Amino acid sequence: GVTTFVALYDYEARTEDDLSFKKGERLQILNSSEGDWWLAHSLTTGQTGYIPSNYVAPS
């Protein structure tokens, strides 16, 4: 299958490439090779961008 995560908190983007998301959105991680900022895609909104990795939990 597919692995997904859930947002634990709201986040409003603080750079142009960050993803804004609402607590409870379901996210897929596209790439985590850059440390604590993961490149994610929201299954909830269809948007894509960097997220702070401490804002998600496993589904």
Task: List the domain count as a whole number.
Answer: 1
Radius of gyration: 10 Å
| Shape type | globular
From the helix content, strand content and strand pairing, which structural class follows? mainly beta
Strand content: 35-45%
Please give the number of β-strands.
5
**Helicity range:** under 10%
Largest sheet: 5 strands, antiparallel
- Output the helix-strand order: EEEEE
The termini sit apart by 13 Å
Number of helices: 0
Order of neighbouring strands in the sheet with most strands:
4-3-2-1-5
PDB class: protein binding
Keywords: beta barrel, SH3 domain, protein binding
Assembly: monomeric
Entry title: Crystal structure of the c-Src SH3 domain mutant S94A-T98D-V111L-N113S-T114S at pH 4.5
Could you provide a short overview of the structure?
It is classed as protein binding. With 59 residues, the chain is an all-beta fold.
Task: Provide key terms for this protein.
59 residues; mainly beta; five-stranded antiparallel β-sheet; 5 strands; 39% strand
Protein architecture, described:
This protein has strands at 5-7, 26-31, 37-42, 48-52, 56-58. The chain is an all-beta fold. The protein has one domain. A 5-stranded antiparallel beta sheet has the order 4-3-2-1-5, with no helix packed on it. A hairpin with a 5-residue loop joins β3 and β4 (48-52). The radius of gyration is 10 Å and the shape is globular. The chain starts with a strand and ends with a strand. The PDB classes it as protein binding. The entry lists the keywords beta barrel, SH3 domain, protein binding. The assembly is monomeric. Crystal structure of the c-Src SH3 domain mutant S94A-T98D-V111L-N113S-T114S at pH 4.5. The protein: Proto-oncogene tyrosine-protein kinase Src.
